[PDB]
């Protein structure tokens, strides 16, 4: 169990950007810029810095050339410069590796702290950042599949209740989670900015990065990404969706970048900013919890996630989940899912919904 420090937590505003290592920068550029239409704040031959349509801070995504594709840093912005110091004291009290760089780790970011957190994740906290031209009314640039904000991260970790307590001490508020009747937690969502989440925990072998998610304005914008990938004949890179989420109620799509880093596109979740925001728990066997329409969850969605790096640039060793597997208990050979609680009609035994089994 991760202890609550005496030191006060930093005041986290929101997820702000992710730094991903990619193996072929030009190919990653094609994906994020030519396919997805993200905007370039800066680039050279080792790094592409990218922002969403509505962003005013320097970037939401840094692509860094490197030998092994992995998450290099998930960054959260904090309220004040003093919160970066608060974050340092907090994590040092946790006994975690910290690195402070007064002019930051990537361009466009100032004084920054990176930590190897209790769950083995490279987190960054910073306040100082270079303001750029906010493109929110730049409809001359607006794509039919326009990504407008960065919404959240999703982390794979073996012991969700352990991680959850830690993120709660750190100030994140749990909004929705998935459990069963035997006390196992499979996933939790938690926020700071007043949307359904800024980060989430998905149970599995970790530390691994499940995905980074971007918002669009409307549902048809997500459809268009799909239609565009069809025209470019890269529909094999649509992993799962599009659909309506049960948890979070967002319209959604999951796609895979050239290094298999998973990107979610997401719109129209709900407001969570009140402190007594009602929490929602779904049962793991509820076939509407992930896809509200009952469409089957793709097995790669449960098994695949990106490596994460430590502060030396080396891959974190993965620890295996010993809690029950969401995959096994829902769509595996001994799995079960229902459409209506207690109704055999519209239930699935030992297979996925809509007539499929695992390949």
């Amino acid at each position: 169990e991760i202890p609550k420090p005496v030191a006060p937590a930093p005041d986290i505003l929101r997820c702000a950007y992710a730094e991903l290592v990619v193996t072929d920068l030009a190919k990653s550029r094609n994906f994020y810029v030519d396919v997805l239409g993200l905007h370039v704040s800066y680039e050279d031959e080792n790094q592409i810095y990218l922002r969403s349509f509505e962003e005013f801070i320097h970037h939401n995504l840094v692509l860094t050339k490197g030998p092994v594709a992995a998450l290099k840093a998930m960054a959260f912005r904090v309220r004040t410069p003093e919160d970066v110091d608060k974050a340092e004291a907090y994590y040092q009290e946790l006994g975690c590796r910290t690195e402070r760089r007064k002019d930051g780790f990537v361009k466009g970011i100032g004084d920054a702290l990176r930590v190897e957190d209790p769950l083995g994740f490279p987190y960054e906290f910073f306040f100082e950042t270079t303001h750029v031209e906010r493109l929110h009314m730049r409809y001359d640039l607006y794509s039919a599949g326009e990504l407008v904000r960065l919404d959240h991260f999703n982390q794979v970790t073996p012991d969700v209740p352990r991680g959850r307590k830690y993120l709660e001490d750190l100030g994140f508020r749990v909004t929705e989670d998935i459990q069963d009747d035997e006390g196992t937690t499979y996933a939790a969502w938690m926020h700071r900015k007043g949307t359904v989440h800024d980060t989430a925990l998905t149970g599995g072998n970790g530390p691994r990065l499940h995905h980074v998610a971007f918002s669009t304005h409307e549902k048809h914008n997500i459809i268009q990404i799909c239609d565009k990938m069809g025209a470019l004949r890269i529909s094999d890179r649509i992993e799962r969706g599009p659909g309506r989420h049960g948890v979070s109620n967002a319209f959604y799509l999951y796609i895979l970048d050239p290094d298999n880093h998973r990107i979610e596109i997401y719109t129209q979740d709900y407001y969570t900013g009140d402190p007594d925001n009602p929490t929602i728990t779904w049962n793991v066997h509820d076939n509407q919890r992930r896809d509200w329409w009952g469409n089957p969850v793709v097995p790669s969605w449960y098994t695949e996630a990106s490596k994460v790096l430590d502060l030396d640039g080396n891959v974190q060793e993965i620890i295996e989940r010993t809690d029950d597997s969401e995959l096994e208990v829902t769509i595996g050979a001994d799995g079960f899912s229902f459409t209506r609680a207690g109704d055999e009609d519209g239930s699935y035994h030992g297979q996925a919904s809509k007539g499929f089994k695992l390949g």
Copy 2:
């Protein structure tokens, strides 16, 4: 095999309505009215007459209580009263059993001919129909999932080229089809009204009715139908979708009524009214042909379809397809599909796309 009559074909305007036999009228009412929001033109203890949002003719759908759920008639409106005579002459020459009713088979339809057509389908031809209030600007009644027009029927028949020639004699013009290099035809689409189709042929054991399709204005209207079904905890009645079609380029959804009659919701296919409209042929192994995003086709979509009735109200016996099965050649144990022709990358062998095997 089906000869070209000397009698000139009736001038067919468009598909106009289907008569479906249902086992439980009230349950069916609940699906088509309460769930789908179709508008009642007339009902009693035995039948419900339903129309879409933009229709001026009496109905697009008749639900008729009966012992066995099945198609009783698929109806096409013809240009003039005299075209019903032409239809009678035409099919009489074909040696088909016909039945003429000077005052209609259903309320709100006048002089009509029903036939047992050469493929064993109960076709109806009529001109005369009672006009009703066209609701096209009744936004006070407009649902978030509003079905605005009846678009097409889809028929299951074992020999596609045979059926195709017969419909081509009848005046329908093929727009799109699915073949393989061995020379099998798996499906064909044909129109009269200047959209992708008014009816279509799907290769399989028949005669069966595959589906009836209604259109919406926008893609979000189809999304809302899925969302509604989830909210009613009947997501298990969503058979396939939502998706973008390859053939037709329409946004789509397949759902199932209480008696398992399949209903498609459909929007935004293209104009086909020019006589040299380019025909498009897809390869059966092309994984973007049915779902443009490469989502797998649910096996029941290939295997399940509705019984049809003869003019005595008896079920037509089913003739087995001897040509190759689209299901077997794409997603069965010996089947395969591709994202890019000749690329093994993004190809699927012996199973379906997105990680799934057949249930």
Copy 3:
């Protein structure tokens, strides 16, 4: 007073393209290609040939450099090569000036007839055209404001019943019109292709071209044109809208090209293909007839329109309308409109709706 010929009418399919004369080709290119995203089928230093997203014929718009901005031809596609000869004999019997070119008048069109029609309009008829790549699934090229089809023309002519009878004998079916209680006609819509219209008559001094209209898939696409025009700081080129039309029920927008040629963006009217399609007559004083939301009709919309050319390239003489002016009787000093017929509340006298007078 325009007689119905003995010669049979040519069978017209649909409106197909317009040829506009523009004064500055490069400025026009910026508008139609860079702003509106139309697709180049061919260009040189004198002409630009442009098509919509779903078109397979060579083009829907030709921009021709010349000294005086005007309509050079509105072209309709006919069903067969022989329908071109029919058209020739038709307008010869009407005693109109005709010109035939076995080679076409513009590139990508073959055998073609241009006429100076009884209302002074340069009409073209052709069947032969060069097929091009149909872009309908080219989502890699899809713009957020994508124009997907050519829908219609709208002509300004002083005597509407005169023109209406002529177009009816020509095979156009009237769908909607605007009249008053003492028998004046202010406008009529008429079709061949089974949408609300392929052309329309607006009472006013003519012959003048009111507009050419293009379709989008969805309402938000028309919204994005406005947003993009704001972003380019050319909102002064948005003439009227966006809105919902009363007549036609379509979502709409009117914009002005660099030569003041009016372009309408249009979507989601209804099906009119049945021969007994219910005609709709609106009273001229009904303030929901043009904009369903009651928004005032911009004065220029009633007064401004494009010059038209004769077959010698000279501007046709304008004949003044003597029938009542729709502007005068609705928003002029002695005009009025109503929200609810006979209701003084929500009526406007001597001014437009929403608190405005004519500037």
Copy 4:
């Protein structure tokens, strides 16, 4: 100048509900429930309590029967029960009349404080509220024009800099404003919840309530509200819109309830929760600042607003603005606006845009 208290400001979470006095409860119910589809949390012969689709607190709107239509209270939820005490100490220090009720002023709210604030507005602060079923996934109930959240209030007040200072002391952050080059402020927007605003100040005679705004998910939802109003033949109650705002970048509509209280429908503004969020200042003469497409602002928008009551139920006396009038400086007989700064072309002198003057 309004002094900044020594007492700490209450931590305000967001605007929460407005209480409006209405003259005819049945007609008002017909507007808010039947037309707009708000959800009834409670009602009797005296009051109706209404919430939006995603709300979990008891209500967003209270309609109270009374002799004179007016704003009775604008309510903000605070973060903790102790914050109600702080609001009390804060307003007491300002020398404002306060009233505290441990069991609330209206049903579904517990311990509450109402004040006559330094601008003469009835503000309520509360924490405790009865939770109700959150309808955010009740797609069985979802309207085509569904109002999903409450977004903001907008207040008319003669001295905007004076009210702005006071609101910034209270912890609201200004996101956007409108000024001229002569030191006049015409309007300001300020938030607590991380959208563009929770309240706003519009220069004019005050205290008066300009409007209350509710959000939709998508732009087509706002379109549907207009379409519905056209169908109910109440388009005369559409005051202004629909449009794209310059300030806030939201899609918008203004409508009038039976007592002329103005309601805005609003979607898709941007995230403002970072403490250094860039403030945007628009020039008052910029014709894209209110409607981005350059549509004229209806004069009633600048002149009409609802009375507000003091804590004894009497109408607050109105203090006249002596600062320049936005109407006058832009669309009045000596007004001016521009499309492009420094460009005479697309500018308007002595009248509104798009060919209109004031009625």
